Symmetry: D2
Subunit: 295 residues, 4 copies
């Protein structure tokens, strides 16, 4: 039981300091109609850190209810750097009808590999839906080592893979050479194709908020091993893939979504804020080179 | 600016059967006080803030405030978050419960820009009328408060009075005090307490002082008295214990040390933190043998 | 178009016997590479202990390579590089004169030139010989990084600069390079990630592992070039373990130890500051070695 | 026998591509007359990499001749990533009158700690003059570990300390807490005072090329345990200390020397070259805040 393919880390639009629930649903429908296989509510791109527990529940519910009747799945953001909370969020995600959960490695308190193992073991035992690990040491301050990922995959039936955001293709080789049964997922848009061509089985994308049809086609080409076409799209997307991180995600992608008229208000919750005017200009310029689908 | 400086301790939070050991916590604070510590920091990183509840947060601060009352030892409360609205709430919370000031860590995980950081700490500084000390620890948070942002916050905001640095970067320490000599630079990295102090730092927020408060207190005060030879001697002697206390992520080794010393009853953490490996346990036990550990 | 040296290539070790280059052994080693499908050999690279050879020994290894590859399709891509531009120009001239088909020229180490400096460094070299020049980026060893913009500028401004050997563990950069300059010959300088580099359109490898297992590195590269990505990945996955262990200590200390343990060279000798591995890494090398099928002479 | 106090990593001025010997001697005289305790010919700052063996000899000879009759010492650059060459250069240096040698850790070929030990041991045993280790991992790609440094200091009588350029005050505490008899020398101008205040016994300076009187005063104030004055100069110097590394040393220091009229042309040897217009301008503006001694 897995969740793979072309996936989108959904932005959370704000209007007057509240979550825009109609817009959120409209953005999700747009992803569905462009060939996305799953959506990820309240991940990093969705500003998970600044959303209350109830806004958390609301976004997941909207995702679950919008994807009903389609083949698109809901991979819910549900993680924490306190295990008792991560377990609680996992349970709530399951209850809200999520198909599975994405669970980030504990940030800031830097647990040991043993602590990481016990953390994810607690979570995976608490629910009977698929759990995808998420490694992003640049944000968390810690790494889930290759050994710990493989142990967790083998010891817990519902832990089925890992989202990697670590800019380390050696590790991707290491992982799939020693445990080829796991689902490696790209969490780094610029290198979607290299991760996929080495046996990765999906992406959880930032760029796909803006260009869902391009990311969908990239992933599906790759899954069918049509690597010429997949590489072509990956090479085409490189500039937008890099510029969407000229400042910390999701600041550029929300700026881009706003400039494309896909969201009403360029609002963040502090400590996140509008990009510098310089980067705002860079994002605008790069956007001109791409064909953006509306609703 | 009202300031909170000198020899300060990042308090561990003892657990017994999964609950905060409130009696033990009070006893440990009194031990710090009577060993020359000038301020205590409840519910910081070393206190496992990330796994404590709002209620336990409150309890710890209240015990600190109560134990320190009548002494002139201050309570620099842990109150920080990667959500600004939460950080503001925690700050007001700490003030309401008697804290003399707050230590507020740079937002972790969501990596705000320098502009976002400035506006984060500005919102915090405006919500309370008590001293605010910034806290930079990029290895844990995934972001850095630049010297420029620190200096601007210090100058623009009356109650922002300095920064706790845990970045292993003595170049940055020079930069800070060469451009803004009025700020209070605080060492948040025990192994280099003396170099930071000798360049004009005005205090430490220590991990090691949990175990050896008298030695850290002495180091700090010797430095403050410009007796650099005695301050350096102590810093040199403490190097071994200072490094071993980070063989695994803080506060895993310091809690192990306190338990081995008999200063806390149970070696308990809350997940995702846990006991050290058996090997690291033995290393900590060995290094401790070379130091005189004050009791209660 | 350009004039190129691509495919499966070996960074030759330099066997010493009683402190001197064993020229007979060197030649025998090169024939072993040829017979096992290798497309080119790199004499006196990092893996050949370039730093500790004299100019004359440099000369000799290149001659042996060229002479042994005569009457075969196998090319000689000679190590010729320095952190001093005037020496680098000199070395490139020597290599040309002794029959090399091209040169491998490492980025200036230790003195950390700026990007402008790197551009002028390589321009000077490329305009001094008529033969192909492969850039070589390895920031972990040199202390500097040739940026993508600089590499592309050099490719476009100098006729005989035809690509770059990357040893930076940075697949993002590899995407950047070939997306903006698809004519570029991107060459893997990191055995562990040979397949990912080739699958993004890299056209060859300069390998350490191939000293010991030239048939496997050859097969991998040719399968990749023939767009059989299933087979190329399988061999890359199989080789991952030896590919990493060969770096348990700084290259070429493990590969030279492997070659000796396999009986492919007579003596295990290094030139200081390089030296034999710890006796435990020694057992580790023996261990991983015996898990692969090693071709003889 | 040791070589400590305020020391200068001498630039090597070129005149139409050739070593400017008149300028070199002039510059050394200026260093001496401003309280410098030793000069370092043909180090990194002197573009050691691009000079020939004869130019190496020339520079050392000029330094030795210029210092004659004074107590100023010549600590000659003499090092290589090939041990047989490093030994040759060490002997060479002794033969031409150097008081001691500065010997950089092997660059590019990344020897093991064991190899580093045998490298420096061979050097130390080939000359009977002081040897100062030189650790600068950002340039070499390797690190002389604290243990290896202390081993070399203890095992070899004439190895008397290390020049550290690694931006790591933690390592400076480790070195001197365990081996207080060694001479720790600052190779990082910006943090000269913190290194000295922890028991360092000198500097090998880039900045002192431009401001020899200030670096000298800094160093001797600290050696006099007058830490207030030593820190005051270090704080005042921070801005020039930092801009002198906006591009790779010695590119900024030669630019400043040229701007100050201390050398008559801005010449390098490839692969080194002039700075960008932007950095050229920044260096000029930072210089305006300091009093620069003439001849
Ligand atoms: Cl995300
Ligand atoms: Cl090589």
């Amino acid at each position: 039981n897995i969740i793979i393919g072309a996936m989108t880390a959904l932005i959370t639009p704000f209007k007057n300091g509240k979550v825009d629930e109609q817009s959120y649903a409209r953005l999700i429908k747009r992803q569905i109609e462009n060939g996305i296989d799953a959506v990820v509510p309240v991940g990093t791109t969705g500003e998970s850190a600044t959303l209350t527990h109830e806004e958390h529940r609301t976004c997941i519910e909207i995702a679950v209810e919008t994807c009903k009747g389609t083949k698109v799945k809901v991979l819910a953001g549900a993680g924490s750097n306190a295990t008792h909370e991560a377990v609680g969020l996992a349970k709530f995600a399951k209850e809200h009808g999520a198909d599975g959960i994405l669970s980030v490695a504990p940030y800031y308190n830097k647990p040991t590999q043993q602590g990481l193992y016990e953390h994810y073991k607690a979570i995976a035992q608490s629910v009977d839906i698929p759990v995808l690990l998420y490694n992003v040491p640049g944000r968390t301050g810690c790494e889930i080592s290759t050994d710990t990922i493989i142990k967790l995959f083998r010891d817990c039936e519902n832990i089925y893979g890992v989202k990697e955001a670590s800019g380390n293709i050696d590790k991707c080789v290491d992982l799939l050479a020693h445990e080829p049964r796991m689902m490696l997922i790209s969490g780094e848009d610029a290198i979607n194709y290299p991760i996929l061509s080495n046996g990765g089985k999906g992406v959880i994308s930032v760029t796909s908020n803006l260009l869902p049809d391009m990311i969908s086609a990239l992933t599906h080409f790759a899954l069918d091993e049509n690597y010429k076409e997949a590489k072509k799209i990956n090479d085409e997307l490189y500039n937008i893939n890099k510029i969407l991180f000229c400042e910390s995600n999701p600041i550029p992608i929300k700026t881009a979504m706003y400039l494309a008229g896909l969201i009403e208000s360029l609002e963040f919750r502090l400590p996140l804020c509008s990009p510098s005017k310089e980067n705002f200009a860079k994002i605008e310029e790069v956007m001109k080179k791409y064909k953006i689908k509306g609703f």
